[PDB]
Amino acid sequence: GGKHTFNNENVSARLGGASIAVQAPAQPPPYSHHHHHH
Amino acid sequence: DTKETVYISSIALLKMLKHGRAGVPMEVMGLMLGEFVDDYTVNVVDVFAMPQSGTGVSVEAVDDVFQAKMMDMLKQTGRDQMVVGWYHSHPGFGCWLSSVDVNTQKSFEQLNSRAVAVVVDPIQSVKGKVVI
């Protein structure tokens, strides 16, 4: 009744994103006004 | 209309496989020679091959004379007799027929009301369990 094949391949890309990280050192100011400047 | 043995000559068979296998993956088709009997032993004698454009799933006979130019070339030896049927091949798919097969088979029967088709499957046809 049917002679064709299908050949289900992985022609599609894909991805899994949980790029979870730790540090975040971005920007500590301990001199918000330099604390008497002097 | 039963109990119909189909004897085959061993010279016939192995020619059916060899040309029936050398063309693999693309399928392949030839002819049978033999002779009807009253009802039961529709024997077979010898076979041969029509030229053809073979695919993995489909094929036809290109030339319409190499089967006619050769019988007339055979009777000089008369090593065989007239035509009785035709075979074809499903290389890995199982043994059955298709809507194309019947349309051509439907010609032979009305032409001659006991002609026969033959199906073979050489890939899964191991040194044991043939499936013809």
Side-chain angles (χ1 to χ4, degrees), chain B residues 49 51-78:
Chain B
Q52 46 184 348
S53 174
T55 64
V57 299
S58 66
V59 58
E60 65 185 359
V62 164
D63 289 330
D64 291 331
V65 289
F66 187 75
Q67 58 268 27
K69 283 187 256 67
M70 195 177 69
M71 289 184 283
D72 295 335
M73 186 179 281
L74 191 148
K75 301 288 98 175
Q76 286 75 20
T77 64

Side-chain angles (χ1 to χ4, degrees), chain A residues 1-3, chain B residues 57 90 93 96 98:
Chain A
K3 294 180 185 172
Chain B
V57 299
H90 291 173
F93 302 150
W96 62 77
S98 66

Side-chain angles (χ1 to χ4, degrees), chain B residues 103-126 128 130-132:
Chain B
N103 285 320
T104 184
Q105 182 59 250
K106 184 266 293 302
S107 174
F108 285 97
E109 188 176 2
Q110 65 180 0
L111 186 154
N112 190 354
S113 297
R114 287 181 187 270
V116 176
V118 175
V119 165
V120 64
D121 192 1
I123 293 170
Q124 64 186 353
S125 191
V126 178
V130 288
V131 285
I132 195 172

Side-chain angles (χ1 to χ4, degrees), chain B residues 19-33:
Chain B
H19 180 73
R21 190 263 180 193
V24 72
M26 58 176 70
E27 74 186 2
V28 71
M29 173 263 285
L31 269 289
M32 286 89 80
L33 299 175

Side-chain angles (χ1 to χ4, degrees), chain A residues 11-26 28-30 33-35:
Chain A
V11 301
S12 184
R14 66 192 294 277
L15 72 178
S19 295
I20 199 167
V22 179
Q23 290 75 236
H33 50 276
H34 291 82
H35 301 289

